[PDB]
């Protein structure tokens with residue numbers, strides 16, 4: 001299927017795995033990060049004895065399979081799910097073995113050392129891979145953006161990373177990760193919908209309402225004013241049609257769901273909102289480059305697909321920062337895949353072909369030394 | 376009958392209504408939450424034309440009246456039954472009108488807005504009441520316990536609420552309700568008794584076996600070991616005498632009925648057992664206060680009248696949590712009425728007499744604004 | 751003969767049901783895409799009005815700064 | 820009984836055919852609306868890009884004028 005000896009770019013982002021060959025502009029195999037295990041034991045004869053579903057095979061059946069998240073906040077919980085999702089991506093979709101081409105994986109900023117050593121060991125010992133490389137997502141996203149300056153805000157599913165890069169210079173001391181993202185928003189919407197009257201307590205419905213949020217939920221331009229005008233609703237409340245057919249009616253809750261990002265007090269945490277944390281990060285940077293960080297801020301992550309984030313960011317930053325300079329916020333189209341796109345354009349360089357880590361040196365050095373070599 | 380202008384404490388708990396005047400230590404009018412409706416049509420002349428029985432009048436006759444539960448999982452199904460049970464409690468037992476004293480009602484945590492607005496409207500418009508107030512059960516139970524710290528586990532009839540309160544401080548974000556309680560235990564015992572050989576499919580027998588459970592069923596200290604030693608039964612199986620006279624023989628099933636609480640998989644639900652859900656709730660709290668929540672856990676609800684719950688909780692929490700600290704579980708005597716008792720001691724304070732909601736402000740504001748004022 | 755006719759009619763019924771389900775799936779996909787595109791159009795119209803207001807502000811500011819120069 | 824069943828099956832077949840035709844019509848309508856919305860959003864993307872370039876030029880000249888002042 002592939003006639004070019006190039007690394008397979010597999011972005012294992014929290015919530016959605018995006019795998020594809022280098023050189024492509026979009027991932028071909030896109031599936032959620034979920035593992036469906038058989039809950040009961042059947043006396044039936046003939047069905048697949050497979051004890052571990054994955055991807056679309058699990059999405060197609062969520063009532064029988066108990067759903068487990070292979071990644072939580074960033075820390076890898078179960079490694080069997082890791083081996084399952086890579087083995088599946090290798091021998092069920094791509095139809096190619098890892099013994100013929102490299103593999104450029106993308107990991108989140110500020111992750112545990114155990115996670116890195118574990119994935120590297122599974123990719124070297126178990127699977128025979130000629131060479132591995134771990135890369136931070138923020139750099140590849142800035143590559144795909146086509147710039148060298150700005151602060152990347154990557155909001156995945158269970159973690160949110162703010163990474164400032166000015167003139168192509170990383171700042172490992174300022175990268176601050178906060179576990180507020182799509183899962184805590186799904187939980188907030190679920191508890192407020194339970195407050196509305198429709199109560200559910202199973203994961204399949206949680207994924208359904210997550211999809212409903214992805215499709216409908218947006219960000220408000222003025223929270224309190226929308227609350228007042230929605231008190232007497234007319235066009236502000238919408239009636240959604242569940243894929244099963246049950247008629248759901250959702251009004252203001254939509255534009256109050258992502259608001260939890262701006263007010264973490266809703267989930268009883270002393271952490272500051274994403275905008276205030278980004279602002280504090282800007283103060284932690286130097287003054288000289290602060291204006292450039294204001295003018296080149298970039299966004300990444302699937303959570304940014306909601307309509308109305310750019311305007312909300314502009315008003316909040318204008319209210320926090322002075323209103324004398326110019327603070328333009330740029331969001332490139334299809335930003336979610338941009339990271340992966342970067343991977344593709346990063347795997348075609350010959351120099352990058354010279355910066356890989358082969359098996360033998362890793363085996364003698366050991367995983368810890370490999371950690372030192374990368375950084 | 377009453378010479379003090381004090382609020383009538385009417386705990387409308389799921390399964391048992393407990394009504395009484397403030398200042399008393401126990402409810403005088405205690406009757407199950409059931410409504411009996413005439414099934415057939417009689418050509419007889421002279422009997423009461425009353426088309427809606429309630430309370431003991433329905434309990435005395437369960438063969439003729441089809442029984443309907445006025446509350447399910449927490450959501451109010453029929454409002455006519457609501458009006459029936461309050462009108463009955465007012466003009467058949469207490470022998471007092473609501474137009475002379477307030478009324479402190481107790482509602483379950485995390486209930487629908489429709490339920491609250493409906494009951495408040497029936498208590499203001501229809502009935503002329505000088506003032507109403509909705510209160511959460513967990514706070515009043517913690518009051519009656521005589522403390523300010525701990526996690527209250529209220530297991531009613533169709534819903535189970537875990538509410539953490541440390542230093543008197545409520546945590547509306549951590550309150551998680553799960554519809555596993557006495558009705559699902561009655562259903563499990565019924566299906567397993569049908570498996571034993573005695574099959575029934577009517578509600579009167581369901582209430583009878585519910586009473587049998589309340590009287591006999593207990594919690595096991597070691598499930599598998601009791602299963603093994605009960606395989607060859609001698610004193611482990613007991614012969615109960617039905618109030619009708621039929622000789623029933625029940626052995627291990629007793630201490631396997633409440634076990635469904637610890638293993639929801641028996642009813643094919645992905646939800647976690649009450650102990651595991653409480654443990655997860657403790658992780659959701661902060662670490663600083665977790666030890667205090669371990670040392671001050673309180674229980675509430677009629678379902679807790681079974682013998683052997685405290686020991687089972689201690690072993691399960693010790694197996695789940697470390698065994699280095701001290702984890703004492705306290706269960707106050709007559710905990711079931713404690714909630715109501717709290718109501719009594721809450722209605723005697725002058726400040727609480729200043730926190731009531733009169734008719735006029737509610738009428739101008741409307742019910743929704745009243746919801747904002749309370750919380 | 752009538753059993754053969756009923757068999758044929760039931761086969762045609764199954765075919766029509768399959769075609770109707772396929773058409774319903776396509777209808778869902780198309781309506782979702784249309785609604786998403788309409789929402790994007792509305793949001794971007796708001797955006798471009800805001801940007802035009804900003805451009806007018808910048809032009810007036812420039813004219814004032816020029817006069818001062 | 821078989822004649823009654825055949826009549827019922829034929830009625831169901833006619834109803835399914837009508838439903839399929841209506842679904843195809845709504846499919847055509849939704850596809851047309853989606854195509855129009857995509858054309859509109861593309862035109863608005865070019866317009867907003869042009870206005871953004873204009874605004875960047877305007878702000879650059881405003882900064883130059885401020886420095887001169």
Ligand SMILES: Nc1ncnc2c1ncn2[C@@H]1O[C@H](COP(=O)(O)OP(=O)(O)O)[C@@H](O)[C@H]1O
Nearest residue numbers: 013014015016156157182214301302303305336
């Ligand atoms: N099309 C979409 N619309 C809205 N939200 C989305 C969409 N796709 C993903 N998300 C949200 O983004 C999160 C996953 O993001 P992720 O795939 O990790 O981004 P990235 O791959 O850029 O790191 C989930 O919480 C999900 O709710």
Ligand SMILES: Nc1ncnc2c1ncn2[C@@H]1O[C@H](COP(=O)(O)OP(=O)(O)O)[C@@H](O)[C@H]1O
Nearest residue numbers: 388389390391531532557589676677678680711
């Ligand atoms: N004396 C008792 N012994 C055992 N179980 C009981 C007893 N009284 C009530 N229950 C159980 O408790 C449930 C009702 O509890 P409820 O009256 O709602 O408690 P509370 O009034 O504290 O909320 C029913 O399912 C019933 O089976």
Ligand SMILES: [Mg+2]
Nearest residue numbers: 155156301302
């Ligand atoms: Mg992301």
Ligand SMILES: [Mg+2]
Nearest residue numbers: 530531676677
């Ligand atoms: Mg209770």
